[PDB]
Design a protein around this ligand. Structure first.
Ligand SMILES: CCCCCCCC/C=C/CCCCCCCC(=O)O[C@H](COC(=O)CCCCCCCCCCCCCCC)COP(=O)(O)OCCN
Ligand SMILES: *[C@@H]1O[C@H](CO)[C@@H](O[C@@H]2O[C@H](CO)[C@@H](O)[C@H](O)[C@H]2NC(C)=O)[C@H](O)[C@H]1NC(C)=O
Ligand SMILES: *[C@@H]1O[C@H](CO)[C@@H](O[C@@H]2O[C@H](CO)[C@@H](O)[C@H](O)[C@H]2NC(C)=O)[C@H](O)[C@H]1NC(C)=O
Ligand SMILES: CCCCCN1C(=O)[C@]2(COc3cc4c(cc32)OCO4)c2ccccc21
Ligand SMILES: *[C@@H]1O[C@H](CO)[C@@H](O)[C@H](O)[C@H]1NC(C)=O
Ligand SMILES: *[C@@H]1O[C@H](CO)[C@@H](O)[C@H](O)[C@H]1NC(C)=O
Ligand SMILES: *[C@@H]1O[C@H](CO)[C@@H](O)[C@H](O)[C@H]1NC(C)=O
Ligand SMILES: *[C@@H]1O[C@H](CO)[C@@H](O)[C@H](O)[C@H]1NC(C)=O
Ligand SMILES: *[C@@H]1O[C@H](CO)[C@@H](O)[C@H](O)[C@H]1NC(C)=O
Lengths: 120, 173, 1230
């Protein structure tokens, strides 16, 4: 499997900013056309995945209604970094966040999974 | 490979003359597509007139009477990368005397690149009646003869000196 | 000493031993050595039992010894095992009894050998888990029994006091760590399981002493390694200051659209195709073409400017940008591995004028330091070996038939008949080539059959004459029986088997003494030094499997960084075979080309560590083996008045000097005759007439020599014969030119013999006369050993021809030059159809192959000089059949053929070469009164007056001045602490110069400027301090004079930087002035005595090296003129580029200095070999010249390059070495 470093559980206070930090590592040098990164959210383990941010030649923020405008990219991918930031976290943000990285020429696709829990 | 040799500057009347204009690429491996034009002015006249234009494979010359029927191509044959633009005059007249200019219009070919170069070779030739020997040749010849004669005289001087000395040494014995 | 004398270990005896301790080593009885014959045989009741210590030196202490059946000694401590089990205990008794056993030793040996067989899987199957478990269990069990026998950490002879058990402990600890909770680095931990392959170094007898001897040799190599680091660092600072960022030049575009700028492009483009769309990228290379500002270095094509931007070539690892990369590039030049590519790259980047830098670097660093390492390893091994040696010392019808067979076996004639038959069969098997008619094939077949029948008949006759028993008692006869079996098996019932009869030629060894010497070398490889070659094999295996375990994961994973098809390259580490091939190629001097790929895929730190360990360790052992093998092998009458006068004239020194000057002028007048001689017609004319002047002068000199010496004294002199021959050729040329009707064939082909006019300088210059006398004296042994090498390489080349005869043909696609995929177009028949269909395909050979035995000799010369061998190995391992398209690594195991060839041919025959040549030089040195053979008489006087400087006498220090503060200054200066402080300050200046790099900050440059300022200030301050101390006697020490010089040069370097900043602008000259500060560093050799001794050895060997360099320069001049004559106008294919062709004298002497180290001679020869189109064009135009055709003579090209290789080998690898060895011995002895 691809070497992707994320916290399995991330506990954040309601109202604070939550950086979702993941590390992707693969040989070679990243290519802009070549490097693609996808982030998805789920309300629960079995719940449908909702893509909320992509990298395809540039960051594409899908502006999902469930996040308002609180999602930001927070990583320099050339550094193997693809972290995201969720500002002013709300209780409904609790759930599973998935990072998928496919990097040419690497055939393999990395996957990081973070369980975000919102304190009180 | 190529050598950028200057043309001869002394044509003789009634005989042939090959005017060298050699403009070869800065890198021999590149592949260009060259054609050339020749301009000329008679001696004592102030302008420039195109006489012939060489192209992909054929030589087209202007309709000036000075060069009609007595000019033929001498550069690279069938290459299309000319790299040598040498005009050959047959039966030089007293009008092929002045400034020739050899315009070389090279169009190099690169990866995503088509360069348009233009090197202008200017050749000044003067027609005369008799082939005059070079001052370099004549002075070097007389210098060779002078050095040979000086070496002969030095050798025979040392020879006769050592001979008188050997005779004087033998006389005492 | 008596059989009854020794007593079994009893508690009563031990009670006495403890009393002696309460009251308070014999090498013959050392643990592990054989018990001496004095004690006789052991009774069966006492073997494998604890006995009382026979050595009284140890008998006082609590020890005991147990004897093996083979009379070996094992020492243990008498304490209880970890305070638990005494020797009298039953468990420890059986533990020791099983420990001391050849059965147990060979059990461990076979177990770790099977472990070494299993480590090479590189992808082991599922079931190897229980095999590794069994191996770990056996290891833990043997460690357990030796623990039970010795004790872990308690006692004098406990399990840990000897170091070879630390490895057995570490290996089981690591194995159990792996089996238990283990870290994340699974591969970097499995790498640690290779020490199971080091276990044999301690298990096998003798290997433990061989490795100790290697560690002893390293202790002597220490000082030469210090000097190697110092010289590489000094030359790396020089190369840094010269070519900082020069390797970064790239010919960039000119017509940029969309306002796109150089930086606006460089920030946005990273792919190689996007790069190629802007930079030049000369048609198939990975890096862009290096460019140049300077006029000589050149040249980028019209429409492209030179600008330093982008990455360096060779992925970024070939550069002088930082000091680390400068050090790596200078190690690459010192080991002369692929140094020709660095040569060409930095010359194209900076200029052809830095050939001076490369000449200095090669001819000092590479040659001098490698010969210093050789001399020091030789002295160390020789002194160790000398110390070792000195401290050591029908039936009646059957009988009638047997009588008649012995009577007709005709010993004085049948041995000679069979030898002649052997030589005829060899010269008959060497008459085989690829294109062979069926009649020729049938002739060869029936000849092989006739010869094998002759040999079978001879073997059966010899057997029945001497029979099976006394017959096979002989080695040559059992060998010939084996060969005749291997030949008879194929009478009617594979060619690798077929190529085995060639070994019969070694039956000449009983008659041929130098072939006997070669047999002796090959046999000492597996005899007296069999343990050393086994250490070499074990080390090569360990490094191969370590490289595999460390990098075969990345290579497979990340192939695309080092290859474009994303398939494995030719040299990888994903298999054990290819990993071993890489380790072998790094044993040969070819490390960098694979280090680049392995770096790219698996990290510079790890690859540098692994490859430097391979280089250093593996080369040290190989060098030791080479030295060992080589060393072991050694042990009126007016006419008379006229004659007198003209003789005085000839002998006159004025006339001699004038003729020397005319010889130099007539030699230099050949350098101007190049392709640019159609220009400079005035110089052309003055040369065309100086030719006649010189011919006349030399004819007059010849006539004077005649009339002065007489025909007897003249023609009894080889020098005068050489002069007569050259003048006669010149006279023939002059007569032909002046008479006309001679511009054809022979005359035009002997005009180029004017390149031999320099040969007239040998007779005049004593520095070349002495070297030529030495070489001519050595030439008989050269001939003998060249004959032996010819016959050995003839064996190998007949094998090569049988294997690869005509299998190198491929369907290259001429545009890119890529083999067709062999799925389409599988053979020549379909290749011709594809050639009818398309235009750019061509069924082409290799131009250097095994098509016949001559081309086989050439291919073997390349494979054995290591310069050009990869292009042959690739096509060999790709070969399939005679008329089939080669498949990618379809054979893959003719790599074994080339490895065997290298090991035998290159290694052993070059060893014979160096050995016999240095031996002949020693014979000559003995014959010439014991004085050196490479120095003239004035040079010998200089050399003695210089060796006087090796005096150890302490001179009078100084008379201290009477003035009080002056004497205080004198003491503070003479302080040794002050001296060492200055030394540390020089080291700090050294690191101040090292910290520089390309692309540094302006702030960093200013800080380094002011640090240099303060360093120069301190140095000049201490200098004027020492002056105020010792005004008169400061300059009486050469080292103090050198200090004054270098501080003057530093201050004037600062002042000249100032004056340039004011009034001039020249980066190159500014840099070369700034090179002055290397003097401030070169003051380190003042205190480093181990460096100061080798530098004195170099100063000693300077005159002989000057004479050898003069001879090499004259040979280089003759060959450069021959080059400018023949090899100009040849196609610019590979290695013969725009720069470094044979066009002019500069380029020709540059290519020739390149070849002087044998580098790239295959590439330089490759474009000359081609003729007979479509490989060339026999009628080209060459604008500016009248000569047509752009292909060279294959025969004259092969002769030129092979003869220059052999000559610059004789002169530079066997006379430089001899001078260095003799002068280093002279230096180190006194
Ligand atoms: C610009 C020059 C271009 C290079 C052209 C190639 C010429 C080759 C040059 C080779 C340099 C070799 C000079 C080494 C001389 C050092 C000898 C020396 O100091 O010995 C001592 C002699 O004393 C002297 O002569 C002092 C004279 C000052 C020598 C200056 C030393 C500079 C060292 C240069 C380093 C050479 C290259 C090193 C790497 C670049 C005494 O010997 P010892 O210490 O008693 O040891 C005896 C042991 N039994
Ligand atoms: C030999 O190789 C060249 C390129 O290395 C091939 O040329 C290509 O041919 C295809 C189709 O014929 C074109 O689409 C490409 O544009 C060509 N590339 C170039 C760089 O010219 C050539 O086809 C190969 N030879 C054969 C017989 O296939
Ligand atoms: C050489 O290769 C060709 C092409 O693979 C072989 O061609 C034979 O004849 C036709 C041509 O394609 C095919 O239908 C046959 O099947 C091919 N025979 C075989 C055995 O593959 C040809 O046989 C090969 N050998 C030669 C020419 O000696
Ligand atoms: C048939 C004999 C052919 C001669 C073989 N030959 C070499 O192998 C090298 C090439 O490779 C070397 C590496 C070295 C060396 C010499 C050489 O000495 C220091 O280290 C060389 C340099 C100059 C002329 C010959 C040769
Ligand atoms: C040149 O042409 C003239 C006639 O115009 C003729 O007389 C002469 O012979 C010609 N010379 C040559 C060399 O053809
Ligand atoms: C050359 O010039 C003269 C006068 O300038 C003219 O009479 C003559 O016709 C010219 N030559 C030719 C071939 O026309
Ligand atoms: C130039 O043209 C003449 C014909 O007028 C021909 O004889 C000659 O060979 C040509 N020169 C070259 C170099 O082709
Ligand atoms: C540029 O190239 C065109 C043809 O592509 C040509 O007509 C023109 O003369 C060239 N101009 C220069 C200055 O080279
Ligand atoms: C090509 O094939 C034709 C038959 O169609 C044959 O006559 C010709 O010789 C062939 N030429 C080559 C170069 O293969």
């Amino acid at each position: 499997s691809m070497e992707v470093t994320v916290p399995a559980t991330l506990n954040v206070l309601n109202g604070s900013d939550a950086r979702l930090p993941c590390t992707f590592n693969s040989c070679y040098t990243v290519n802009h056309k070549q490097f693609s990164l996808n982030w998805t959210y789920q309300e629960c383990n079995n719940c449908s995945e909702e893509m909320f941010l992509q990298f395809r030649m540039k960051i594409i923020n899908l502006k999902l209604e469930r996040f308002q405008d609180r999602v930001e990219f927070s990583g320099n991918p050339s550094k193997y970094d693809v972290s995201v930031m969720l500002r002013n976290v709300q209780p409904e943000d609790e759930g599973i966040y998935n990072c998928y990285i496919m990097n040419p020429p690497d055939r393999h696709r990395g996957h990081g999974k973070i369980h975000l829990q919102v304190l009180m | 490979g190529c050598v950028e040799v200057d043309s001869e500057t002394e044509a003789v009347y009634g005989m042939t003359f090959k005017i060298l204009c050699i403009s070869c690429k800065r890198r021999s491996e590149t592949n260009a597509e060259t054609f050339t034009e020749w301009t000329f002015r008679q001696k004592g006249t102030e302008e420039f007139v195109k006489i012939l234009r060489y192209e992909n494979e054929v030589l087209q010359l202007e309709e000036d009477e000075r060069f009609e029927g007595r000019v033929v191509w001498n550069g690279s044959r069938g290459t299309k990368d000319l790299q040598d633009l040498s005009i050959f005059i047959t039966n030089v007249t007293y009008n092929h005397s002045g400034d020739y200019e050899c315009h070389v219009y090279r169009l190099l070919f690169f990866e995503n690149y088509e360069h348009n170069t233009s090197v202008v070779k200017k050749i000044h030739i003067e027609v005369v009646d008799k082939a005059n020997r070079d001052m370099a040749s004549i002075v070097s010849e007389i210098m060779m003869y002078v050095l040979i004669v000086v070496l002969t005289i030095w050798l025979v001087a040392e020879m006769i000196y050592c001979y008188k000395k050997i005779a004087a040494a033998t006389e005492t014995a | 000493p008596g059989p009854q004398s020794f007593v079994h270990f009893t508690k009563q005896s031990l009670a006495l031993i403890e009393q002696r301790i309460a009251e308070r080593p014999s090498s013959d009885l050392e643990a592990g050595k054989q018990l001496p014959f004095i004690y006789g045989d052991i009774p069966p009741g006492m073997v494998s039992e604890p006995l009382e210590d026979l050595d009284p030196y140890y008998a006082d202490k609590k020890t005991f010894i147990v004897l093996n059946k083979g009379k070996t000694i094992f020492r243990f401590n008498a304490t209880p095992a970890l305070y638990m089990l005494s020797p009298f205990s039953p468990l420890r008794r059986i533990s020791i009894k099983i420990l001391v056993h050849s059965l147990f030793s060979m059990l461990i040996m076979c177990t770790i050998l099977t472990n070494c067989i299993f480590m090479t899987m590189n992808n082991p199957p599922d079931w190897t888990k229980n095999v590794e478990y069994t191996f770990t269990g056996i290891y833990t069990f043997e460690s357990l029994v030796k623990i039970l026998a010795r004790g872990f950490c308690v006692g004098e002879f406990t399990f840990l006091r000897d170091p070879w058990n630390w490895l057995d402990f570490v290996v089981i600890v690591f194995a159990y760590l792996t089996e238990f909770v283990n870290l994340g680095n699974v591969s970097a931990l499995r790498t640690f399981r290779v020490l199971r392959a080091l276990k044999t170094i301690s298990v096998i007898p003798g290997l433990k002493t061989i490795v100790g001897a290697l560690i002893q040799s390293v202790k002597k190599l220490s000082d030469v390694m210090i000097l190697t680091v110092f010289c590489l660092s000094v030359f790396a600072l020089i190369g840094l200051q010269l070519f900082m960022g020069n390797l970064k030049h790239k010919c960039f575009r000119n017509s940029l659209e969309n306002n796109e700028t150089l930086e606006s492009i460089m920030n946005t483009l990273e792919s190689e195709e996007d790069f190629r769309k802007y930079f030049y990228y000369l048609e198939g290379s990975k890096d862009a073409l290096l460019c140049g500002f300077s006029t000589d270095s050149g040249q980028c094509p019209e429409g492209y400017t030179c600008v330093k931007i982008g990455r360096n070539p060779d992925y970024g690892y070939t550069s002088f940008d930082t000091f680390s990369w400068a050090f790596l590039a200078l190690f690459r030049l010192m080991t002369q591995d692929y140094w020709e590519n660095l040569y060409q790259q930095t010359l194209r980047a900076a200029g052809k004028t830095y050939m001076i830098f490369f000449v200095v670097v090669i001819f000092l660093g590479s040659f001098y330091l490698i010969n210093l390492i050789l001399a020091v390893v030789a002295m160390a091994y020789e002194e160790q070996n000398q110390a070792n040696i000195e401290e050591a010392k029908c039936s009646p019808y059957w009988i009638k038939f047997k009588k008649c067979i012995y009577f007709i076996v005709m010993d004085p004639f049948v041995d000679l008949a069979i030898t002649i038959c052997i030589v005829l069969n060899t010269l008959f098997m060497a008459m085989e080539h690829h294109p062979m008619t069926e009649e020729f094939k049938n002739v060869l077949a029936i000849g092989n059959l006739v010869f094998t029948g002759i040999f079978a008949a001879e073997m059966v006759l010899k057997l029945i004459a001497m029979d099976p028993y006394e017959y096979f008692q002989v080695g040559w006869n059992i060998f010939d029986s084996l060969i005749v079996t291997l030949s008879l098996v194929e009478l009617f019932l594979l060619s690798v088997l077929r190529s085995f009869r060639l070994l019969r030629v070694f039956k000449l060894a009983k008659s041929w003494p130098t072939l006997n010497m070669l047999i002796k070398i090959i046999g000492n490889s597996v005899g007296a030094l069999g343990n050393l070659t086994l250490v070499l094999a074990i080390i090569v295996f360990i490094f191969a499997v370590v490289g595999m375990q460390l990098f075969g994961k990345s290579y497979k994973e990340c192939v695309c960084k080092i290859n474009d098809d994303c398939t494995l390259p030719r040299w990888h580490m994903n298999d054990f075979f290819h990993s071993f091939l890489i380790v072998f190629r790094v044993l040969c001097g070819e490390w960098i080309e694979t280090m680049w790929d392995c770096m790219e895929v698996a990290g510079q730190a790890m690859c540098l560590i692994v490859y430097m360990m391979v280089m250093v360790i593996g080369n040290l052992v190989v060098l030791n083996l080479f030295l060992a093998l080589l060393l072991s092998s050694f042990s009126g009458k007016i006419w008379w008045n006229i004659r007198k006068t003209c003789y005085k004239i000839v002998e006159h020194s004025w006339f001699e000097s004038f003729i020397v000057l005319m010889i130099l002028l007539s030699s230099g007048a050949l350098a101007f005759e190049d392709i640019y001689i159609e220009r400079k017609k005035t110089i052309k004319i003055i040369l065309e007439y100086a030719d006649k002047i010189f011919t006349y002068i030399f004819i007059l000199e010849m006539l004077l020599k005649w009339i002065a010496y007489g025909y007897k004294t003249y023609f009894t002199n080889a020098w005068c014969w050489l002069d007569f021959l050259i003048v006669d050729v010149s006279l023939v040329t002059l007569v032909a030119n002046t008479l006309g009707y001679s511009d054809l064939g022979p005359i035009k082909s002997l005009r180029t013999l004017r390149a031999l006019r320099p040969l007239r300088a040998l007779s005049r210059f004593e520095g070349m006369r002495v070297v030529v006398n030495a070489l001519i004296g050595a030439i008989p042994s050269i001939m003998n050993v060249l004959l032996v090498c010819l016959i050995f390489w003839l064996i190998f080349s007949i094998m090569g021809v049988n294997l690869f005869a005509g299998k190198f043909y491929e369907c290259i696609n001429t545009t890119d030059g890529s083999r067709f995929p062999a799925s389409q177009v599988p053979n020549r028949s379909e290749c011709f159809a594809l050639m009818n269909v398309s235009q750019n395909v061509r069924w082409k050979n290799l131009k250097v192959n095994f098509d016949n035995v001559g081309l086989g000799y050439l291919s073997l010369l390349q494979v054995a000089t290591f310069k050009g061998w990869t292009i042959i190995m690739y096509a060999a391992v790709d070969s399939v059949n005679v008329d089939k398209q080669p498949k990618y690594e379809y054979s893959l195991y003719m790599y074994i053929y080339f490895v065997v060839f290298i090991i035998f041919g290159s290694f052993f025959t070059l060893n014979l070469f160096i050995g016999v040549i240095i031996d002949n030089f020693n014979q000559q040195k003995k014959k010439l009164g014991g004085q050196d053979i490479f120095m003239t008489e004035e040079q010998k006087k200089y050399y003695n007056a210089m060796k006087k400087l090796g005096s150890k006498k302490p001179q009078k220090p100084i008379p201290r001045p009477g003035n009080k503060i002056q004497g205080c200054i004198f003491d503070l200066v003479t302080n040794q602490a002050f001296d060492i402080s200055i030394m540390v300050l020089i080291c700090l200046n050294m690191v101040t110069m090292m910290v520089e790099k390309e692309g540094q900050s302006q702030h960093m440059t200013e800080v380094l400027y002011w640090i240099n300022v303060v360093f120069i200030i301190l140095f000049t301050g201490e200098c004027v301090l020492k002056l105020i101390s010792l005004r008169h006697y400061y300059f009486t020490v050469g080292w103090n004079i050198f200090d004054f010089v270098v501080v003057i040069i530093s201050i004037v370097g600062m002042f000249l930087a100032d004056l340039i900043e004011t009034y001039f602008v020249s980066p190159t000259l500014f840099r070369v002035i700034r090179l002055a500060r290397i003097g401030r560093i070169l003051r380190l050799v003042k205190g480093a005595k181990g460096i100061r001794t080798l530098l004195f050895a170099l100063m000693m060997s300077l005159p002989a090296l000057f004479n050898i360099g003069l001879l090499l320069f004259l040979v280089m001049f003759i060959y450069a003129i021959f080059g400018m004559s023949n090899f100009a106008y040849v196609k610019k294919e590979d290695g013969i580029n725009d720069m470094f062709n044979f066009e002019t004298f500069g380029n020709s002497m540059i290519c020739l200095f390149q070849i002087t180290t044998s580098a790239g001679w295959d590439g330089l020869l490759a474009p000359i070999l081609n003729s007979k189109p479509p490989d060339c064009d026999p009628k080209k135009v060459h604008p500016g010249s009248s000569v047509e055709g752009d292909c060279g003579n294959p025969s004259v090209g092969i002769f030129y390059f092979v003869s220059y290789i052999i000559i610059s080998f004789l002169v530079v690898v066997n006379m430089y070495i001899a001078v260095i060895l003799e002068n280093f011995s002279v230096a180190t002895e006194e």
